[PDB]
Design a protein around this ligand. Structure first.
Ligand code: HEM
Ligand code: DAO
Length: 422
């Protein structure tokens, strides 16, 4: 079985030989060493091969331009069979089109992408803004509180329930299933190492999603107006009316949607407060010019970079960065490094809400796999900060945030926040 990752002090990157830099360490982000580790890789070995890691050997691509090329070159780099650095526990690999190459990727993505179509997102705006306001007003203003479960996880869990028309009181299952899936120690160095519970969740997921398919189909056959959820959309198109006869296209598509939006949205909502705390002149600039929120949302997403990387496999030998990536080698596109590449962003470690090229960030990736839910993610963040400006004159992080163990997700498990209303 995959042993748990136990945290040990990560030394300064300059004490290491270039060949010994291992950025798969799932504690790099928590210990605040990722910036120095990736900067040295960008400057001295932008295409870096690590032959010794707990996940096996892999290439690290750390420069913005080189990540662009790898992400856009689905002719040279495959997203199959997995896009995380390591491997899922054997038997637990789920086929998701995020880890599929064209043309099969295009067919499956096209059958689900309507759930985040612009018209369908506008139909969700009122509920998103209603829930955001209902969560923010319920927050205490006389004492600090943990922002992660109070706001980030709360709003995220509701959004995921809306996307699937999942039972509202069972929405916590979607978060729990997604957390254990994305936090598998064998895949991302996360803290979930019990493979038995992963098989249990996969069984509960199949049963619960199947029962949801039946219930929606029965409700549809009874004349219930079709909603804006993925299930309603899938049962309204001829090509996916029988998707239940394809359990893997069914479970994989539904599993990808909830894992895709779970801790990404959660950590984007928390990360904006961390950036505001580290650069408070941007909060004054925001209150003076609230029209900057759309661009600030992009800058929040760039600065946080909730998904640290996507992994590829070289379909062939590929020359890149002066190195020869061999066919079959694993290649890791470090978005978290690309978004801090000063070759692309001036003062890249600085949170600048009116940054002219904030929209050019690679937190959503690029190419055929570029985040399908990116507009929904930006919509939730825009509404959250619109509703924050309506209510609060200042937001203070009163404690050192606690960061999640993972090399894949960059997020916070604890964010103590003190609110000051206006
Ligand atoms: C700020 C929040 C988010 C970030 C940073 C993010 C990040 C990413 C990244 C890096 C990829 C892979 C890009 C690539 O390989 O080139 C991706 C793909 C994807 N994301 Fe997100 N995501 C976010 C929110 C969401 C949400 C809210 C949803 C759905 C509700 C979602 C659904 C998906 C799906 C379905 C894919 C697969 C698309 C494909 O492979 O064609 N994401 N996302
Ligand atoms: C965003 C990608 C989802 C994370 C995939 C990691 C491993 C695939 C899931 C296999 C089942 C499991 O880990 O419990």
């Amino acid at each position: 079985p995959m042993p748990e990752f136990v945290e040990t002090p990560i030394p300064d990157v300059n004490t290491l030989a270039l060949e010994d830099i291992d950025v798969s360490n799932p504690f790099l982000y928590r210990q605040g060493q990722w910036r120095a580790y990736f900067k040295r890789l960008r400057d001295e070995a932008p295409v870096h091969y690590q032959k010794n890691s707990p996940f096996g050997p892999f290439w690290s691509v750390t420069r913005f331009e080189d990540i662009l090329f790898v992400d856009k070159s689905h002719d040279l780099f495959s997203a199959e069979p997995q896009i995380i650095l390591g491997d899922p526990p054997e038997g637990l690999s789920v086929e998701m089109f995020i880890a599929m190459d064209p043309p099969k990727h295009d067919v499956q993505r096209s059958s689900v992408q309507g759930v985040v179509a612009p018209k369908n997102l506008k139909e969700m705006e009122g509920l998103i803004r209603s829930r955001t306001g209902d969560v923010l007003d319920s927050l205490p203003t006389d004492k600090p509180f943990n922002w992660v479960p109070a706001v980030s996880k709360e709003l995220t869990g509701r959004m995921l329930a809306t996307l699937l028309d999942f039972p509202y009181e069972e929405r916590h299952k979607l978060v729990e299933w997604s957390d254990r899936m994305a936090g598998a120690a064998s895949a991302t160095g996360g803290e979930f190492a019990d493979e038995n519970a992963m098989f249990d969740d996969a069984a509960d997921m199949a049963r619960s999603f199947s029962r949801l398919w039946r219930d929606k189909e029965a409700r549809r056959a009874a004349g219930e107006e079709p909603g804006f959820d993925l299930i309603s959309l899938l049962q309204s198109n001829k090509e996916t009316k029988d998707l239940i006869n394809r359990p893997m296209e069914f479970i994989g598509n539904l599993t990808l949607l909830i894992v895709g939006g779970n801790d990404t949205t959660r950590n984007s909502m928390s990360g904006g407060l961390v950036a505001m705390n580290e650069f408070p002149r941007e909060f004054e600039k925001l209150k003076a010019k609230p029209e900057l929120i759309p661009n600030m949302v992009s800058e929040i997403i760039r600065w946080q970079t909730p998904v640290a990387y996507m992994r590829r496999i070289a379909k062939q030998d590929v020359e890149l960065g002066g190195q020869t990536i061999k066919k079959g080698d694993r290649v890791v596109m470090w978005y978290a490094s690309g978004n801090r590449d000063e070759r692309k962003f001036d003062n890249p470690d600085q949170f600048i809400i009116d940054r002219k090229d904030a929209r050019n960030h690679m937190s959503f990736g690029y190419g055929v796999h570029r985040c399908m839910g990116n507009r929904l993610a930006e919509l939730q963040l825009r509404i959250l900060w619109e509703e924050i400006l309506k209510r609060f004159d200042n937001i203070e992080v009163v404690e050192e945030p606690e960061r999640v163990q993972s090399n894949f997700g960059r997020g916070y498990s604890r964010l103590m926040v003190k609110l000051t209303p206006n």
